[PDB]
Amino acid sequence: ETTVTQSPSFLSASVGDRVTITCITTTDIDDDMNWFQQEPGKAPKLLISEGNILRPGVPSRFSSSGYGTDFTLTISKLQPEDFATYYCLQSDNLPFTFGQGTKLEIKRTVAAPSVFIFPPSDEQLKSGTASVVCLLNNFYPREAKVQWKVDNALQSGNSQESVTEQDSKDSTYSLSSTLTLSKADYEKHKVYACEVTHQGLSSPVTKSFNRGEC
Amino acid sequence: EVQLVQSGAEVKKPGESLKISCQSFGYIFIDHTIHWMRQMPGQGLEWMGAISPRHDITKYNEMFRGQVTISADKSSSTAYLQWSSLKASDTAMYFCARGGFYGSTIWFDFWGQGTMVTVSSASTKGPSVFPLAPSSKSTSGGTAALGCLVKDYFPEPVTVSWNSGALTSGVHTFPAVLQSSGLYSLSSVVTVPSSSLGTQTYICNVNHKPSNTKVDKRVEPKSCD
Ligand SMILES: [Ca+2]
Ligand SMILES: [Ca+2]
């Protein structure tokens, strides 16, 4: 198949900036290049047909270029609506192949996370499983490392993370990490800690607690 | 007006068969082609194949030939996508999209709304809701943090509201994570003032429609030695 290599995978920019995505085919595809926007939970919407034809209703700020192998989408005057994912599609030969997508993030200033640790509830403990939870609240950028530590032993393979989408208002992220033990292993150990590293912290912050303490 | 209307979400066990559909409104069926796209969770789009109803011609991406069957009923302008034995890795959203014939100039100007297909061992199960109590190690400055751990449910989704919708600022409901069990698990949190904690009551409203489970859980603070 004609492989389509889209870049950048992710991209940060500010309202009013002017970004450009690029796709490169491994076979010539003349002007058979298409561009879609996808908001989450929606189906892709076509913006540009073969030969850079703006689709009826696509705003003036969208535009397209390329012939042969190297193709570019270009958005001037990035409005708020335009923060989403974009895909390119070659329609020159079967199978149709898509670029792997570009994700558009609002750029803002660094914000350190607010960190909170939650010991397993007593209701949960009466059923034999312990879930320790670590919340990192409202930080930017997205990159952040959680290190669970159990009596100072760094944990691995012990936890699961999940991250919100960018908040519409403050453009921060929030992270939840869950360390899950059997009630037995839980009670083997005393001090339970959550160590966050993040560009907005001069050094790592730790939240901790003692089992039993509350 | 042109609509491509897809069938509703599916939860299946591996090895069952499944047929999802796409009905075309507002244009002449035999004048176009219907295409099927896969989009696995959190990833890009993939072209699976297409059908031209005028000729009964069916084309497949080779990565899907022999795992799925695209068909059509001309009399209802419906296209079908069919599996005879599902695997868990068929878990994804499936879109239909309209296109042209060999040598057309416009592709996928219209899309159905998508059909989510979940394939899993697990059986339907209601969540256990556990408090994430505020304390001193959930006290930033004048900001406290509390929440609910919605654990061990299947399938997705669950909704979470705070104070039957009365509390909305500072709320973060995270994406579920799929456990090795699994059985999804998620958490909803909120940041509130330390002082108010005190005088204000926080209850999370958890709704897991697939299991007809609704639960309300109060999040009371805690005392440390
Ligand atoms: Ca052409
Ligand atoms: Ca061509």
Side-chain angles (χ1 to χ4, degrees):
Chain A
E1 78 201 4
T2 296
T3 311
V4 194
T5 318
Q6 187 176 343
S7 79
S9 285
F10 309 75
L11 186 76
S12 324
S14 324
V15 182
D17 293 18
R18 192 203 92 122
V19 307
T20 89
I21 301 135
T22 81
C23 298
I24 293 81
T25 77
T26 68
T27 83
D28 195 303
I29 61 129
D30 59 278
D31 71 327
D32 302 326
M33 176 54 47
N34 306 265
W35 298 89
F36 300 87
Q37 170 189 87
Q38 201 186 15
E39 288 144 79
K42 276 171 166 151
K45 162 170 137 224
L46 180 74
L47 319 170
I48 277 153
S49 148
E50 288 176 354
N52 325 281
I53 289 110
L54 210 74
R55 292 326 306 174
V58 178
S60 323
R61 51 214 206 251
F62 285 98
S63 56
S64 166
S65 163
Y67 200 107
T69 47
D70 311 349
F71 312 91
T72 83
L73 180 76
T74 286
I75 317 159
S76 324
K77 180 128 285 189
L78 263 189
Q79 294 192 32
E81 309 78 61
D82 306 352
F83 284 89
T85 295
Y86 294 90
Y87 298 94
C88 63
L89 162 86
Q90 63 91 3
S91 41
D92 179 76
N93 71 95
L94 300 203
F96 288 96
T97 59
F98 288 86
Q100 286 333 106
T102 285
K103 205 185 176 200
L104 268 206
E105 163 216 80
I106 302 127
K107 183 135 57 193
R108 52 148 290 154
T109 59
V110 175
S114 303
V115 178
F116 311 83
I117 185 156
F118 294 100
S121 79
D122 267 321
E123 291 95 305
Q124 191 192 8
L125 285 165
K126 200 184 199 204
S127 323
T129 304
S131 279
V132 201
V133 175
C134 198
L135 164 53
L136 291 50
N137 208 39
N138 306 331
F139 54 92
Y140 183 90
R142 208 186 188 277
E143 292 60 29
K145 182 81 200 167
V146 172
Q147 250 307 331
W148 286 99
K149 302 192 188 154
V150 170
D151 280 336
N152 288 336
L154 269 72
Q155 303 303 99
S156 195
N158 243 332
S159 55
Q160 294 181 280
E161 275 189 9
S162 147
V163 185
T164 67
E165 284 330 272
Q166 205 166 16
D167 190 83
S168 58
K169 311 142 213 92
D170 56 56
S171 315
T172 62
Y173 300 91
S174 295
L175 190 145
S176 184
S177 187
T178 308
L179 167 80
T180 308
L181 318 194
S182 68
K183 189 181 155 257
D185 301 315
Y186 183 60
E187 299 176 353
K188 272 194 223 309
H189 304 104
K190 284 156 173 110
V191 175
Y192 285 86
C194 171
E195 183 194 40
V196 173
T197 303
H198 181 277
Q199 172 192 333
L201 311 156
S202 37
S203 40
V205 193
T206 305
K207 260 53 215 201
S208 324
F209 70 86
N210 262 80
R211 177 186 48 69
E213 163 161 87
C214 34
Chain B
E1 171 235 0
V2 166
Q3 296 162 263
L4 265 48
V5 183
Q6 287 194 237
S7 62
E10 300 277 357
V11 183
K12 310 245 88 164
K13 260 98 175 167
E16 321 190 310
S17 65
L18 172 65
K19 196 192 202 142
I20 61 185
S21 52
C22 176
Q23 193 163 34
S24 269
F25 288 95
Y27 73 87
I28 302 197
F29 201 39
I30 45 149
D31 281 358
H32 281 82
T33 53
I34 292 301
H35 303 243
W36 287 103
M37 253 70 66
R38 186 168 81 183
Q39 181 165 42
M40 278 169 323
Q43 288 156 85
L45 296 136
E46 317 160 77
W47 181 82
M48 304 170 86
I51 189 153
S52 153
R54 184 181 285 287
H55 305 295
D56 295 49
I57 283 187
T58 321
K59 288 175 164 312
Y60 300 80
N61 185 329
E62 289 290 321
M63 282 175 12
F64 300 95
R65 180 181 304 271
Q67 307 155 246
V68 313
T69 289
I70 300 176
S71 52
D73 171 353
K74 288 176 220 193
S75 91
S76 65
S77 317
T78 301
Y80 300 93
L81 179 56
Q82 193 170 19
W83 299 259
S84 59
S85 194
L86 288 165
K87 317 171 191 179
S89 44
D90 297 322
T91 298
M93 185 83 68
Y94 294 90
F95 298 97
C96 56
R98 199 181 76 179
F101 293 79
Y102 162 50
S104 301
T105 166
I106 298 168
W107 296 100
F108 311 152
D109 52 355
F110 291 95
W111 296 61
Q113 87 279 14
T115 306
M116 183 71 203
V117 174
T118 318
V119 184
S120 181
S121 283
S123 308
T124 319
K125 185 183 169 292
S128 319
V129 184
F130 298 124
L132 311 163
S135 66
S136 299
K137 45 224 91 191
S138 99
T139 305
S140 179
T143 321
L146 63 105
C148 279
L149 178 67
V150 190
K151 190 152 195 292
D152 296 335
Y153 63 86
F154 185 90
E156 303 226 57
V158 303
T159 38
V160 186
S161 53
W162 287 96
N163 292 349
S164 289
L167 164 51
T168 72
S169 305
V171 174
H172 291 296
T173 305
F174 290 83
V177 303
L178 180 51
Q179 288 159 106
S180 74
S181 38
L183 264 42
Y184 298 90
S185 178
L186 66 66
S187 57
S188 196
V189 303
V190 61
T191 36
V192 303
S194 320
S195 50
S196 318
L197 200 90
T199 71
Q200 279 123 30
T201 280
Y202 298 102
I203 315 154
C204 65
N205 321 104
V206 181
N207 191 20
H208 182 236
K209 291 189 158 211
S211 68
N212 282 284
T213 302
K214 223 171 84 161
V215 168
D216 290 294
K217 194 72 217 50
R218 324 168 211 147
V219 199
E220 276 138 7
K222 264 217 111 173
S223 34
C224 315
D225 184 75

